[PDB]
Structure formats: C-alpha cells, structure tokens
Coordinates of C-alpha atoms in Angstrom, one line a residue:
Chain A
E753 CA 69.8 167.4 14.2
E754 CA 73.5 166.8 14.0
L755 CA 74.2 169.8 16.3
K756 CA 71.9 168.3 19.0
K757 CA 73.9 165.0 18.9
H758 CA 77.1 167.0 19.4
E759 CA 75.4 168.9 22.2
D760 CA 74.2 165.5 23.5
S761 CA 77.8 164.5 23.4
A762 CA 79.1 167.8 25.0
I763 CA 76.6 168.1 27.9
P764 CA 77.7 164.9 29.9
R765 CA 81.4 165.9 29.2
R766 CA 80.8 169.4 30.6
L767 CA 78.9 167.9 33.5
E768 CA 81.5 165.2 34.2
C769 CA 84.5 167.5 34.3
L770 CA 82.9 170.4 36.2
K771 CA 81.4 168.2 38.9
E772 CA 84.8 166.5 39.3
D773 CA 86.3 170.0 39.7
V774 CA 83.7 170.8 42.4
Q775 CA 84.2 167.4 44.0
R776 CA 88.0 167.8 44.3
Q777 CA 87.5 171.3 45.8
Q778 CA 85.2 169.7 48.4
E779 CA 87.9 167.0 48.9
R780 CA 90.4 169.8 49.2
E781 CA 88.1 171.5 51.7
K782 CA 87.7 168.3 53.8
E783 CA 91.5 167.8 53.9
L784 CA 92.1 171.5 54.9
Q785 CA 89.4 171.8 57.6
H786 CA 90.4 168.5 59.2
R787 CA 94.0 169.8 59.8
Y788 CA 92.7 173.3 60.7
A789 CA 90.3 171.9 63.3
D790 CA 93.1 169.8 64.9
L791 CA 95.5 172.8 65.2
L792 CA 93.1 174.8 67.4
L793 CA 92.7 171.6 69.5
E794 CA 96.6 171.5 69.6
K795 CA 96.5 175.2 70.6
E796 CA 94.1 174.3 73.4
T797 CA 96.7 171.9 74.7
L798 CA 99.2 174.7 74.7
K799 CA 96.6 177.0 76.3
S800 CA 96.0 174.3 79.0
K801 CA 99.7 174.6 80.1
Chain B
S6 CA 85.4 118.9 88.9
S7 CA 84.6 122.4 87.4
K8 CA 87.8 122.6 85.2
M9 CA 87.1 119.1 83.8
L10 CA 83.4 119.8 83.2
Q11 CA 84.3 122.8 80.9
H12 CA 85.7 120.2 78.4
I13 CA 82.5 118.0 78.0
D14 CA 81.2 117.1 74.4
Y15 CA 84.5 118.5 72.7
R16 CA 86.9 116.3 70.8
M17 CA 89.6 115.3 73.3
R18 CA 93.1 113.8 72.8
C19 CA 94.3 111.4 75.5
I20 CA 97.8 110.0 76.0
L21 CA 97.8 106.6 77.7
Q22 CA 100.4 105.2 80.1
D23 CA 102.1 102.9 77.5
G24 CA 102.7 105.8 75.0
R25 CA 99.6 105.3 72.8
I26 CA 97.2 108.1 71.8
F27 CA 93.4 108.1 71.6
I28 CA 91.3 110.9 70.1
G29 CA 87.6 110.9 71.0
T30 CA 84.4 112.8 71.7
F31 CA 84.1 113.0 75.4
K32 CA 80.9 112.2 77.4
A33 CA 81.4 110.8 80.9
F34 CA 83.9 111.1 83.9
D35 CA 84.1 109.8 87.4
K36 CA 85.9 110.2 90.7
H37 CA 88.6 107.7 89.6
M38 CA 88.9 109.5 86.2
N39 CA 87.3 106.8 84.3
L40 CA 86.3 108.0 80.8
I41 CA 84.0 107.3 78.0
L42 CA 85.4 108.5 74.7
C43 CA 83.2 108.3 71.6
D44 CA 83.7 108.3 67.8
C45 CA 87.3 107.5 68.5
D46 CA 90.6 106.9 66.9
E47 CA 93.7 105.0 68.0
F48 CA 96.7 106.8 66.6
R49 CA 100.5 105.9 66.8
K50 CA 103.7 107.3 65.5
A59 CA 109.8 109.7 57.2
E60 CA 109.0 108.2 60.6
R61 CA 106.0 105.9 60.0
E62 CA 102.5 106.8 61.4
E63 CA 99.2 105.0 61.5
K64 CA 95.5 105.6 62.5
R65 CA 93.1 102.9 63.7
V66 CA 89.4 103.4 64.6
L67 CA 87.7 102.3 67.9
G68 CA 84.1 102.7 69.1
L69 CA 82.8 104.0 72.5
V70 CA 86.0 103.3 74.4
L71 CA 85.8 102.9 78.2
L72 CA 89.1 103.9 79.8
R73 CA 89.9 102.5 83.3
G74 CA 91.3 105.5 85.2
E75 CA 94.7 104.1 86.1
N76 CA 96.1 104.4 82.5
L77 CA 95.4 108.1 81.9
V78 CA 98.3 110.6 81.8
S79 CA 97.0 113.7 80.2
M80 CA 94.2 115.0 78.0
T81 CA 94.0 118.0 75.7
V82 CA 91.4 119.9 73.5
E83 CA 91.7 120.3 69.8
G84 CA 88.3 120.9 68.3
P85 CA 85.3 123.1 68.4
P86 CA 82.3 120.9 69.6
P87 CA 80.5 118.3 67.5
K88 CA 77.6 120.5 68.3
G99 CA 61.5 139.0 71.4
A100 CA 59.1 141.9 72.2
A101 CA 55.5 141.2 71.0
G102 CA 53.9 142.7 67.9
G103 CA 51.8 145.6 68.9
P104 CA 48.4 147.2 68.1
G105 CA 49.6 149.6 65.3
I106 CA 48.4 149.3 61.7
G107 CA 49.5 151.4 58.7
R108 CA 47.1 152.3 55.9
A109 CA 47.1 154.5 52.8
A110 CA 45.5 157.9 53.5
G111 CA 45.0 161.3 52.0
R112 CA 45.8 164.5 54.0
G113 CA 43.0 167.0 53.1
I114 CA 43.8 170.7 53.5
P115 CA 41.5 172.7 55.9
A116 CA 39.8 175.8 54.7
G117 CA 42.0 178.9 55.0
Chain C
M1 CA 101.0 119.8 106.9
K2 CA 98.7 118.6 104.1
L3 CA 100.9 120.0 101.2
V4 CA 98.3 119.3 98.5
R5 CA 96.5 122.3 100.0
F6 CA 99.7 124.3 99.4
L7 CA 99.3 123.2 95.8
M8 CA 96.0 125.0 95.6
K9 CA 97.1 128.4 97.0
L10 CA 99.8 128.5 94.3
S11 CA 97.3 129.3 91.5
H12 CA 98.0 131.6 88.5
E13 CA 101.8 131.6 88.9
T14 CA 104.0 129.7 86.5
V15 CA 105.6 126.3 86.7
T16 CA 107.5 123.6 84.9
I17 CA 106.6 120.0 85.8
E18 CA 108.3 116.8 84.9
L19 CA 105.9 113.8 84.7
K20 CA 107.0 110.3 85.7
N21 CA 107.5 109.0 82.1
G22 CA 110.1 111.7 81.2
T23 CA 107.5 114.1 79.8
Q24 CA 107.9 117.8 80.7
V25 CA 105.1 120.4 80.6
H26 CA 105.6 124.2 81.0
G27 CA 102.5 126.0 81.9
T28 CA 100.6 128.6 83.9
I29 CA 98.3 126.8 86.4
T30 CA 94.6 127.1 87.2
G31 CA 92.6 124.5 89.1
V32 CA 94.1 121.7 91.2
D33 CA 92.2 119.0 93.2
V34 CA 92.4 116.9 96.4
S35 CA 94.1 114.0 94.5
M36 CA 96.7 116.5 93.0
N37 CA 94.9 116.5 89.6
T38 CA 96.6 119.4 87.7
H39 CA 95.1 121.6 85.0
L40 CA 97.4 124.0 83.1
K41 CA 96.6 126.6 80.5
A42 CA 99.1 128.3 78.0
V43 CA 100.9 124.9 77.7
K44 CA 104.2 124.1 76.1
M45 CA 105.1 120.4 75.9
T46 CA 108.3 118.5 75.4
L47 CA 108.1 114.7 75.2
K48 CA 111.0 112.3 75.9
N49 CA 113.7 113.2 73.2
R50 CA 110.9 114.3 70.7
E51 CA 110.6 118.0 69.8
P52 CA 108.4 120.7 71.6
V53 CA 104.7 121.2 71.1
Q54 CA 102.5 124.1 72.3
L55 CA 98.9 123.6 73.5
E56 CA 96.0 125.8 74.7
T57 CA 95.0 123.8 77.8
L58 CA 96.2 120.5 79.3
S59 CA 94.8 118.4 82.2
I60 CA 97.2 116.1 83.9
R61 CA 96.1 113.2 86.2
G62 CA 97.4 113.2 89.8
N63 CA 99.4 110.0 90.1
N64 CA 101.6 110.6 87.0
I65 CA 103.3 113.6 88.5
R66 CA 106.9 113.7 89.9
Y67 CA 108.6 117.0 90.8
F68 CA 107.3 120.5 90.1
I69 CA 109.7 123.4 89.5
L70 CA 108.5 126.4 91.4
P71 CA 109.6 130.0 90.5
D72 CA 112.0 132.0 92.7
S73 CA 109.2 134.6 92.7
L74 CA 107.7 132.7 95.7
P75 CA 108.3 134.1 99.1
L76 CA 107.9 130.8 101.0
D77 CA 107.1 132.1 104.5
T78 CA 103.3 132.4 103.8
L79 CA 102.9 128.6 103.6
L80 CA 103.2 128.1 107.4
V81 CA 99.5 129.1 107.9
Chain D
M25 CA 66.7 190.2 80.3
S26 CA 66.8 190.2 84.1
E27 CA 67.9 187.3 86.3
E28 CA 64.9 188.1 88.4
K29 CA 62.5 187.3 85.6
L30 CA 64.5 184.2 84.8
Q31 CA 64.0 182.9 88.3
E32 CA 60.3 183.5 88.0
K33 CA 60.4 181.8 84.6
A34 CA 62.1 178.8 86.2
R35 CA 59.4 178.7 89.0
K36 CA 56.6 178.8 86.4
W37 CA 58.3 176.1 84.3
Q38 CA 59.0 173.8 87.3
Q39 CA 55.4 173.9 88.6
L40 CA 53.9 173.4 85.1
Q41 CA 55.9 170.3 84.2
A42 CA 55.5 168.7 87.7
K43 CA 51.7 168.8 87.5
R44 CA 51.6 168.0 83.7
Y45 CA 53.5 164.7 84.2
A46 CA 52.3 164.1 87.8
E47 CA 51.9 160.4 88.6
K48 CA 48.1 160.8 89.3
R49 CA 47.7 162.0 85.6
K50 CA 49.4 159.0 83.9
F51 CA 47.6 157.3 81.0
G52 CA 46.8 154.1 82.9
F53 CA 45.2 155.9 85.9
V54 CA 41.9 154.7 87.2
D55 CA 40.3 156.8 90.0
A56 CA 39.5 155.2 93.4
Chain E
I59 CA 51.2 158.9 51.8
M60 CA 50.9 156.5 54.8
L61 CA 49.1 157.0 58.1
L62 CA 50.3 155.3 61.2
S63 CA 47.7 155.3 64.0
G64 CA 47.8 153.2 67.2
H65 CA 49.5 155.4 69.8
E66 CA 47.0 155.9 72.5
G67 CA 48.4 159.2 73.5
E68 CA 50.5 162.1 72.2
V69 CA 53.5 161.1 70.0
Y70 CA 56.5 163.2 71.1
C71 CA 59.3 161.6 69.1
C72 CA 60.0 159.6 66.0
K73 CA 63.3 158.5 64.4
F74 CA 64.2 156.5 61.3
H75 CA 66.8 153.8 61.8
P76 CA 70.1 154.6 60.1
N77 CA 69.7 151.9 57.5
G78 CA 66.3 153.4 56.5
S79 CA 64.4 150.0 56.6
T80 CA 62.8 150.4 60.0
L81 CA 61.2 153.2 62.1
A82 CA 60.8 153.9 65.8
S83 CA 58.0 156.0 67.4
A84 CA 57.3 156.8 71.1
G85 CA 55.4 159.3 73.3
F86 CA 52.9 159.9 76.1
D87 CA 51.7 156.3 76.0
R88 CA 55.2 155.3 77.4
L89 CA 55.4 152.6 74.7
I90 CA 58.1 152.5 71.9
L91 CA 56.5 151.1 68.7
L92 CA 58.9 149.8 66.0
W93 CA 57.5 150.0 62.4
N94 CA 58.7 148.7 59.1
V95 CA 59.1 151.5 56.6
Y96 CA 58.3 149.4 53.4
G97 CA 55.4 147.2 52.7
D98 CA 52.2 147.5 54.8
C99 CA 54.1 149.6 57.4
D100 CA 53.3 147.0 60.0
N101 CA 54.3 147.1 63.7
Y102 CA 56.6 144.6 65.4
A103 CA 57.4 145.8 68.9
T104 CA 56.1 147.0 72.2
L105 CA 58.9 148.3 74.4
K106 CA 57.4 148.4 77.9
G107 CA 60.1 149.2 80.4
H108 CA 59.4 152.9 81.2
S109 CA 57.0 154.2 83.8
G110 CA 56.6 157.8 82.5
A111 CA 56.4 159.7 79.2
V112 CA 59.2 159.0 76.6
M113 CA 60.6 162.4 75.7
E114 CA 63.1 161.6 73.0
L115 CA 64.4 158.7 70.9
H116 CA 67.8 158.4 69.3
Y117 CA 69.6 155.5 67.6
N118 CA 73.3 154.8 67.7
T119 CA 75.1 155.2 64.3
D120 CA 75.0 151.5 63.6
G121 CA 71.4 151.1 64.8
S122 CA 71.8 148.2 67.2
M123 CA 71.0 150.4 70.2
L124 CA 68.0 152.6 70.8
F125 CA 68.2 155.3 73.5
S126 CA 65.0 156.7 75.2
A127 CA 65.1 159.6 77.6
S128 CA 62.0 159.6 79.9
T129 CA 60.3 161.8 82.4
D130 CA 60.5 158.8 84.8
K131 CA 64.1 160.0 85.7
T132 CA 65.7 157.1 83.8
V133 CA 67.4 156.6 80.4
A134 CA 66.7 153.1 78.9
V135 CA 69.1 151.4 76.4
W136 CA 67.3 148.9 74.2
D137 CA 68.7 146.2 71.9
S138 CA 66.9 146.8 68.6
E139 CA 66.9 143.1 67.5
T140 CA 65.6 141.5 70.7
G141 CA 63.8 144.4 72.4
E142 CA 65.5 143.8 75.7
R143 CA 66.2 146.8 77.9
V144 CA 70.0 146.3 78.1
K145 CA 70.6 148.9 80.9
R146 CA 68.9 151.5 83.1
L147 CA 70.8 154.8 83.9
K148 CA 69.0 156.1 87.0
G149 CA 71.3 159.0 88.0
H150 CA 68.9 162.0 87.6
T151 CA 66.8 163.6 90.3
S152 CA 64.2 165.2 87.9
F153 CA 62.6 164.6 84.5
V154 CA 65.0 163.7 81.7
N155 CA 64.1 166.0 78.8
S156 CA 66.7 164.8 76.2
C157 CA 69.6 162.5 75.4
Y158 CA 72.0 162.0 72.5
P159 CA 74.7 159.4 71.9
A160 CA 78.2 160.0 70.6
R161 CA 78.9 160.0 66.9
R162 CA 82.4 158.4 67.2
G163 CA 83.1 155.6 69.6
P164 CA 83.1 154.7 72.6
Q165 CA 79.4 154.4 73.5
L166 CA 79.2 157.8 75.4
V167 CA 75.8 159.4 76.2
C168 CA 74.9 162.8 77.5
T169 CA 71.7 164.0 79.0
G170 CA 69.8 167.2 80.0
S171 CA 67.3 167.4 82.8
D172 CA 64.9 169.8 84.6
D173 CA 67.2 169.5 87.7
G174 CA 69.6 172.0 86.0
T175 CA 72.3 169.3 85.7
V176 CA 73.9 168.2 82.4
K177 CA 75.3 164.7 83.0
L178 CA 77.7 162.8 80.8
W179 CA 77.7 159.0 81.0
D180 CA 79.5 155.9 79.9
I181 CA 77.4 152.8 79.3
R182 CA 80.1 150.5 80.9
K183 CA 79.7 152.3 84.3
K184 CA 76.6 152.7 86.4
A185 CA 77.4 156.2 87.5
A186 CA 77.8 159.6 85.8
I187 CA 81.4 160.5 85.0
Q188 CA 80.9 164.3 84.9
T189 CA 78.1 166.7 85.8
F190 CA 77.9 170.3 84.6
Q191 CA 75.6 172.4 86.8
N192 CA 73.5 174.8 84.8
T193 CA 71.6 177.5 86.7
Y194 CA 68.2 176.6 85.0
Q195 CA 66.4 173.7 83.3
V196 CA 67.9 172.1 80.2
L197 CA 65.5 171.1 77.4
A198 CA 67.8 169.7 74.7
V199 CA 71.4 168.4 74.5
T200 CA 73.5 167.1 71.7
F201 CA 77.1 166.3 71.3
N202 CA 79.3 167.9 68.7
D203 CA 80.7 165.8 65.9
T204 CA 84.1 165.1 67.6
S205 CA 82.2 163.7 70.7
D206 CA 84.3 166.0 73.0
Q207 CA 81.7 168.8 73.5
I208 CA 78.2 168.9 75.0
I209 CA 76.0 171.6 73.6
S210 CA 72.9 172.4 75.7
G211 CA 69.9 174.6 75.2
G212 CA 67.7 175.6 78.1
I213 CA 65.0 178.0 79.3
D214 CA 67.8 180.6 79.9
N215 CA 67.6 181.3 76.1
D216 CA 71.4 181.3 75.6
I217 CA 73.1 178.4 74.0
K218 CA 75.9 177.0 76.2
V219 CA 78.8 174.8 75.0
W220 CA 80.8 172.9 77.5
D221 CA 84.2 171.2 77.0
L222 CA 84.6 167.8 78.7
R223 CA 88.4 168.1 78.8
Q224 CA 88.7 171.4 80.7
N225 CA 85.4 170.8 82.6
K226 CA 84.5 174.4 81.9
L227 CA 82.1 176.6 79.9
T228 CA 84.0 177.4 76.7
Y229 CA 81.8 179.7 74.6
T230 CA 78.2 180.9 74.6
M231 CA 75.9 182.1 71.9
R232 CA 73.3 184.8 72.3
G233 CA 70.4 185.8 70.1
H234 CA 67.4 183.6 70.8
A235 CA 64.7 185.3 72.9
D236 CA 63.1 182.2 74.6
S237 CA 63.4 178.6 75.7
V238 CA 65.5 176.4 73.3
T239 CA 63.1 173.4 72.9
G240 CA 65.2 171.6 70.3
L241 CA 68.8 171.2 69.1
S242 CA 70.1 169.2 66.2
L243 CA 73.6 168.9 64.6
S244 CA 74.2 168.4 60.9
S245 CA 75.7 165.1 59.7
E246 CA 78.9 167.0 58.7
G247 CA 79.1 168.4 62.2
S248 CA 79.7 172.0 61.1
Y249 CA 76.3 173.5 61.8
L250 CA 73.7 173.3 64.6
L251 CA 69.9 173.8 64.1
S252 CA 68.0 175.4 67.0
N253 CA 64.3 175.8 67.7
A254 CA 63.1 178.2 70.3
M255 CA 59.8 179.6 71.7
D256 CA 60.5 183.0 70.2
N257 CA 59.0 181.8 66.8
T258 CA 62.4 181.6 65.1
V259 CA 64.5 178.7 63.8
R260 CA 68.2 179.4 63.4
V261 CA 71.4 177.9 62.1
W262 CA 74.6 178.5 64.0
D263 CA 78.2 178.0 63.0
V264 CA 79.5 175.4 65.5
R265 CA 83.0 175.1 63.8
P266 CA 86.0 176.4 65.9
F267 CA 86.8 179.1 63.3
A268 CA 83.4 180.9 63.1
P269 CA 83.1 184.7 63.1
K270 CA 82.3 186.3 66.5
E271 CA 78.6 186.5 65.5
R272 CA 77.9 182.8 64.9
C273 CA 74.3 183.2 63.7
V274 CA 74.5 182.5 60.0
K275 CA 70.9 182.1 58.9
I276 CA 67.5 182.9 60.4
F277 CA 64.3 181.0 59.5
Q278 CA 60.8 182.0 60.4
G279 CA 57.2 180.6 60.1
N280 CA 56.8 178.1 62.9
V281 CA 54.5 178.8 65.9
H282 CA 54.7 177.9 69.6
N283 CA 51.3 177.9 71.2
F284 CA 50.1 177.8 74.9
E285 CA 50.8 174.0 75.3
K286 CA 54.6 175.0 75.4
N287 CA 55.6 171.6 74.0
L288 CA 59.3 170.7 73.3
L289 CA 59.1 171.1 69.5
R290 CA 62.1 169.5 68.0
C291 CA 64.3 170.2 64.9
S292 CA 66.1 167.9 62.4
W293 CA 68.4 168.2 59.4
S294 CA 68.1 166.4 56.1
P295 CA 70.9 163.9 55.5
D296 CA 72.4 166.0 52.7
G297 CA 72.1 169.2 54.7
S298 CA 70.1 170.9 52.0
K299 CA 66.8 170.9 54.0
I300 CA 65.7 171.6 57.6
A301 CA 62.5 170.6 59.4
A302 CA 61.0 172.0 62.6
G303 CA 58.1 171.0 64.7
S304 CA 55.3 173.6 64.7
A305 CA 52.2 173.9 66.9
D306 CA 50.0 175.3 64.0
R307 CA 49.5 171.7 62.6
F308 CA 51.6 172.5 59.4
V309 CA 54.7 170.5 58.6
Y310 CA 57.5 172.8 57.6
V311 CA 60.5 172.1 55.4
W312 CA 62.8 174.9 54.4
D313 CA 65.5 175.0 51.8
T314 CA 68.7 176.0 53.6
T315 CA 70.1 178.0 50.7
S316 CA 67.2 180.0 49.4
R317 CA 65.6 180.3 53.0
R318 CA 62.1 179.7 51.5
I319 CA 59.5 177.2 52.5
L320 CA 59.3 174.2 50.3
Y321 CA 56.5 172.2 51.8
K322 CA 53.8 173.3 54.3
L323 CA 51.8 170.1 54.4
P324 CA 48.4 170.0 56.2
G325 CA 46.4 167.2 57.6
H326 CA 47.5 166.8 61.2
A327 CA 45.0 167.9 63.8
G328 CA 47.4 168.6 66.7
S329 CA 50.8 170.1 67.5
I330 CA 53.6 168.5 65.6
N331 CA 56.3 167.6 68.0
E332 CA 59.0 166.2 65.7
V333 CA 59.6 165.8 62.0
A334 CA 62.3 163.3 60.7
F335 CA 63.8 162.6 57.3
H336 CA 64.5 159.2 55.8
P337 CA 68.3 158.7 55.3
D338 CA 68.3 157.6 51.6
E339 CA 65.0 157.9 49.9
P340 CA 63.1 161.3 50.1
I341 CA 60.4 160.1 52.6
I342 CA 59.4 162.4 55.5
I343 CA 57.6 161.4 58.7
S344 CA 56.0 163.9 61.1
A345 CA 54.9 163.0 64.7
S346 CA 52.0 165.0 66.2
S347 CA 49.9 165.3 69.3
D348 CA 46.9 164.0 67.3
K349 CA 48.0 160.3 68.1
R350 CA 48.9 159.8 64.4
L351 CA 52.1 159.5 62.4
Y352 CA 52.0 160.7 58.8
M353 CA 54.5 159.4 56.3
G354 CA 54.9 160.6 52.8
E355 CA 57.1 160.9 49.7
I356 CA 58.5 164.3 48.9
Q357 CA 60.3 165.4 45.7

C-alpha cells in the first residue's frame, strides 16, 4: 500500500521530467531546422548569381 | 462645399473675429458661411481661463475666421434547407 | 486673369498664410472655393505672440486672409494658361 | 510510360470532363 | 454520430473552420452550405454565386475568408461573416480543379486547371502574376509552408514542384503510377500527403534536405473506381493520422507511425470524395456522393 503511494508519487515525476526532455529536444529540433532551411535558401541566392 | 460637408455632426471649434472661441456640434451651413452650432460653449483665456455655456447659436457669417475639428461624432446569406439529426451507420453484410 | 482660379490649381503643395488679425497658419492645402475659402490639412498654428499649436484640419473663411507665402518649388510659367 | 500514351490519356480525360460537367447537364436543367 | 443531409447533389468537398466551431460543405449542387458543429448541427448559409460545380473549399488560416474553386472557370472569395462574394478571379480558360491559399501572409492564392496552366494570384490585383505551363491537366495544387513554392499533381503521374522566385521547375518526384487526384501538406510543413488512382496513398519528404528518394511511407487500402472522381487527402492536426477519400464507401484513417488502419467506418452509400478532421476535438466528417455528410466522434 505504501509502495503504491510512492509509485503514485514517482510516476508523474518520471513523466514530467522525461516529457520535458523530449519537448526540449523538439524545441532544439525546431531551432536547428529553421536555421538549416534558411541556409539552403541563402545558398539558392548564391546559386542565382 | 464638399470639404465643409465632411465635417457635419462633429464637435467643431470656431474662432470669432473679436478673439472669442465657441465649441459646438455643427448642423447647418450656407453660401455666406452662416452656421448653426449646437450644445455649445463660450470659452475664453496662471493666466485666467473661463467657460460659459450657450444654446443653439446662430452665427452671422461675417464674424467667422476659422473652424477646427476635435471630437469623434456625437453619433446576410439566408438560412438553408439542411438539417442535422442523430443517426446510426449500419455495417453492410460482408 | 481671375487669380482665384490660380489658387485652385496650386493644390497639395505646401504654404504658410498670415491671416488679417496677425494669425499665421502653416499647412498643406486641399480644397479652395470661388470666394477664396481655404481648407488646410496637417496644420500648425501660431497666434499673435501666443505659442504654437498643431491641428489635424483647419478651414479658413475667405475674407480673413491676407498674403500667402508660396514655395520656391513653383515654376511660375504654367499660370499663363 | 510513353509520352504517346500520356497524350491519349489527356485526350480521354479532356473529353470525359467536358461532357460530365457540360452546361446541358447542370442540376437545374429542364428540357425544352 | 451526426448525419447532415440536404445537398441535392454529390458533395465533393468539406472543411472545418480553423476555430472548430463552424463547418463548410459544397459540391455538385453549386451551393456552399455553412453548418454549426455543435448543438443541432443547423445550417445558416446558402452561397449562391457560382454557376458550375464547386470542386474544392479552403479557409484562410484566420477563417474570415472562404475560397471555392469551381468548374465554372472562376475562383470565388467569400466573407465568412456576411456571405458576400468579395471577389471573382476569372483568369482561367478551363475548369478550375483546385485552389489553396498561402499559410503566411500576404493573401496569395494558387490554382490548378484542366487547361494545363498553374496560375498564381494576388487578391489585390485582378490578373494572374505568374503562370507555369504544365504539359497536361492539373488536378490538385497546394503551397508549401513558406508560401514560396507551388506543388502540383496532375494526370502525368509525377509530382512537380515550382519555385516562384526562379520561375522554373526545381525538383520532381517519381513513383506514383497514375493521376494525382489529391495533395495535402501537413501543418508543420515538412511532409506532403498524396492520393493517386494507382490505389496507393503516399507520404513524401518535402523538406529541402530530404534523401534523393523522397518517398518515406506507402499506405494502401483505398480504391478508385470507374467514376474517376478527384478523391482528396487530409492530415490530422497533430500529424499522427491521415485520411483519404475512397470509392469503396469505407472511411479510412491510418496511423502514420504503425502504417495500420485504425478506422474503416461503413454507412455511406456512394464514393467518399473528401474526409476532414476537426482541429481540436477528435471529430471526423466524411463527404460522399450519396448526398450526405456523416460526422462522428473518434477516440
């Protein structure tokens, strides 16, 4: 009974941190891909010359 | 005409020939630039300053010098045949 | 001839005017009438001695006016026709 | 995939749509 | 489950409004009917301006403007509040199969027609700014996410991507065996969904940095029959699910990750031309040639 309450404490904590880890990596992905998309576009300006 | 007509029903500030000021809601004008101002104040100019009230003032055109604005004014497709209702789907055989 | 018609062609240039009672306006102009009735927009005032004021639009009766002050940005020659 | 067959496919498609949505086949049509 | 009768003819297209609260439907009857999603699903419009079949409906991203491409050679722009036809773009010589408005501003629109032209527009001007001449009929167009590219699918099977800046064909994708009846771009802009008459639905990597083979996933299980209708495709808002119109009367939703069917829902009597997802709640509508719209909760 006690163990379940500690598990009930642990499960949101594990969910909170790991989802935040995943979320930051997606935020990292969004920042990376935004720059990376722009630089090909920049390369196309160079290619246009 | 057309420039003056744009101003109508606004709250207009007039400067008379003697130096006085009127402020009034504006609804008439005429070929001699007669005016009817309405809901109106007489206003004169620490240098002392004062504010008297007048009603429905009719201004003989000779006096007017200038007038100015400072206020905003003292102011589908038919329903169609469709109906929604609750329904089941019903799978066919096979 | 008929210089008041020259004062309608002049539209949407810029002017100072001094009125008769020592008033000065500084304005860009749109609209004028047969009896010289002036209307200016983008209006900066200066009364007699009293300090400047700035106004959205100002309409000035005809017979209060004295001299305009045209800009040097007029080539005059066009007025002959 | 031959360009020949594509041109025939275009011809088939053009004729099909033109008659399907022909003005004399509109919903509101009443015959003479 | 809700049933929405009252179209006198085939329903080709249906779209939820971006706020989810209202719904648009249109088709062979030429009328555009606007429905409330909640409550008794009542109707409160007839849009009347067209003279031919309405082929596709799209909202702008704020929802004030409804775009309808029609077989009458015109694209109508409607104000959603008043129902006034705001403008009539009348530049096309043949049937307008599709349209799609830009994600980002300004209010650009692009169009695909059976005349083989792909025409870009601007709502401010009455004429087309640019026209790309395709050799064969164009059945569906969409922008990319950045609003700089037109992607077009036509009866020439290949997918063609134009660039508005260079005015030139920029890359092409090969793999479909038949006419590309429907194109749809994910809300994130990375991926495109395609429907073709070769009985395959596919997902393509539209991103600049894709591998040389851009076909990432292949889905099966829809049918194109002898009516050869323009069966459309749509994405779920989260990108987890895809839907495709099918002519075998079943409503298909696939899971994009597991590549399985998740729902295969009977009850329509005719070919299902378009299926759309609600933006926030898990409600799905499917438009069919049986003159009915079916709306229902999924889990």
